[PDB]
Amino acid sequence: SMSNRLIFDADWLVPEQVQVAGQAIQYYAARNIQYVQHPVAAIQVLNVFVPAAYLHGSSVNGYQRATAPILMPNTVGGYLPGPADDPQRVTWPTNAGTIQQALKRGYVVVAAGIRGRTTVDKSGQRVGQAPAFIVDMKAAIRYVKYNQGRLPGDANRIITNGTSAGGATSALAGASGNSAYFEPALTALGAAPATDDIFAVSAYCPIHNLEHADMAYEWQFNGINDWHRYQPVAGTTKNGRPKFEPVSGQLTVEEQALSLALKAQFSTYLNQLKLTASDGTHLTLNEAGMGSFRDVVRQLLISSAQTAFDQGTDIHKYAGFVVTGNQVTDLDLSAYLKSLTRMKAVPAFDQLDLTSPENNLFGDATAKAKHFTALAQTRSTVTAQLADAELIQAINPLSYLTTTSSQVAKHWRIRHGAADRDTSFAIPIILAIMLENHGYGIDFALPWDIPHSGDYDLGDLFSWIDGLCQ
Ligand SMILES: O=C(O)c1cc(O)c(O)c(O)c1
């Protein structure tokens, strides 16, 4: 209710500690803060964790109470609900380890709970489908910025972080600062009266640009007709993590035919983005999907391999690399992708029977799931409607670089593992190039043999943050 003034009180902070690399890290915690006045789901609370020094007038890693970066990680995966995280949390999902390391680094951490596609209200109604995830992230950001000074840390140094769907969340927050599209939703929640633009973005394998991901997936994997992914088994770990196991399949003749069309359409989509290299050349693909853009993907994988090679890693785990002397001189991309293996079938994102996480994400209070591409709606195997075009646009980070309607974070660090096949490499690469093209700071790479995952390079992430903030 409006009795919730959304005013943070440092008096709420209580002392705790956690071991990191065999040493005690002292911090203060305040949990379960209702960050909007009119929440519709119990998950909509946030936790605040502060390096202990900041409650005693001292410094950590060059930062003080007033100047410390504010890291805002999320636990969103598969566009499911992401509970408020905690350095003490052991239940799945969690990035507790990252919070612990962040505190050691001197960052204030504000970990918000975020609704997801399965979130229902007290009456069992669905209230977490798009764009709930990003509304909640923005509401938490507004809570933080509204409470500048009261909350330890610099509210002008908010850095979001997340993996996969959570990476898309982080990227979207960075791209869509103060967009008018979300104002109605935020007003309805009674979010704090403040801005929601942020300082920097960290994103691991952001699963985004969903309405073009099917074309990108087939551009990449056409010609590879076996797929290998996971399905759930009964039971969880003691900490609630769902159990999985490998299951393979083979594309049908019909899927193979559909793949070829999706692949062909990608060339036009890609070309019409008008992406450029550093020297300014238009990056493109021809009718058969070859060209300068394809060469960029290849080069990024060669760079990834060289970095691993120099560390003594055997890059011939995967096929296609040409090593001359101690230099990775070339790559047969098709061969690499074949050894890497296709994970998803066709279409990979907009499934014709509405069964994908993305389909459910684009459902609403009436329909459990929707299509979000013309192709899938046309080819639908079940009764279905297309999601609202503006909504699709609104939750795509790219939209804010290509049609200005927001304030964009100046600093971006994006990673997508060289072994990650949840989405085509073209997807994060398009984001990175578009960022660079529009003058934003972008640190991008495809780390060698890293699977679908995040937070695996914390030393480097934190050095990047410190480079921006100290
Ligand atoms: O958050 C994830 O792990 C995730 C989310 C997705 O929407 C998705 O299509 C995927 O392959 C992985």
Q: Residue 79: which CATH number?
A: 3.40.50.1820
**Cα separation, 323 vs 84, whole angstroms:** 46
The answer to whether 338 is annotated as binding is: no
Range of the domain at 468: 1-470
SS3 of 87, please? coil
Evaluate whether 44 touches 36 at the Cβ level (below 8 Å): yes
Choose one of 172, 207, 211, 217 to mutate for the ligand 1 pocket test, by most ligand atoms within 8 angstroms of C-beta: 207
Q: 195: number of CA atoms within 13 Å, CB side?
A: 15
Report which protein residue has its CA nearest ligand 1's atom 11. Answer: 422
Distance 349 CA to ligand 1 centre (A): 9
Phi–psi pair at 33, nearest 5 degrees: -85, 120
Residue with tokens 């709420």: 12
Method used for this model?
Answer: X-ray
Beta bridge partners of 48: 30, 110
The answer to whether 411 is annotated as binding is: no
Choose one of 80, 164, 210 to mutate for the ligand 1 pocket test, by most ligand atoms within 8 angstroms of C-beta: 164
Q: What total number of domains does the chain contain?
A: 1
Residue with tokens 């798009």: 130
Evaluate whether 347 touches 262 at the Cβ level (below 8 Å): yes
CB-neighbour burial class of residue 375 (10 A; exposed 0-12, middle 13-18, buried 19+): middle
To one decimal place, what's the resolution in Å? Answer: 1.8
Report which protein residue has its CA nearest ligand 1's atom 10. Answer: 422
The answer to whether 422 is annotated as binding is: yes
Sort residue 320 into left (φ over 0), alpha (ψ -120 to 50) or beta: left
SS3 of 72, please? strand
Residues in the ligand 1 pocket, defined by CB under 6 Å: 77-79, 164-165, 207, 357-358, 422
- Residue 435, H or E segment: helix 426-437
Sorted by sequence, the CB contacts under 8 Å of residue 401 that are 6+ apart come out as 175, 408, 434, 435, 438
Q: Positive or negative, the Cα torsion across 196, 198, 202, 205?
A: positive
- Gap positions in the chain, given as the residue before each gap (C–N > 2.5 A)? none
Nearest ligand 1 atom to the CA of 343 is: 11
**Cα separation, 233 vs 47, whole angstroms:** 32
Distance 56 CA to ligand 1 centre (A): 42
The answer to whether 245 is annotated as binding is: no
**DSSP at 317:** G
Assigned token pair, 323: 């090593």
**Cα separation, 367 vs 429, whole angstroms:** 33
Distance 184 CA to ligand 1 centre (A): 28
Task: Tell me how far the alpha carbon of residue 188 is from its chain's centroid.
Answer: 26
Assigned token pair, 266: 């990608």
**Cα separation, 185 vs 384, whole angstroms:** 25
Distance 331 CA to ligand 1 centre (A): 28
Residue with tokens 């046309």: 378
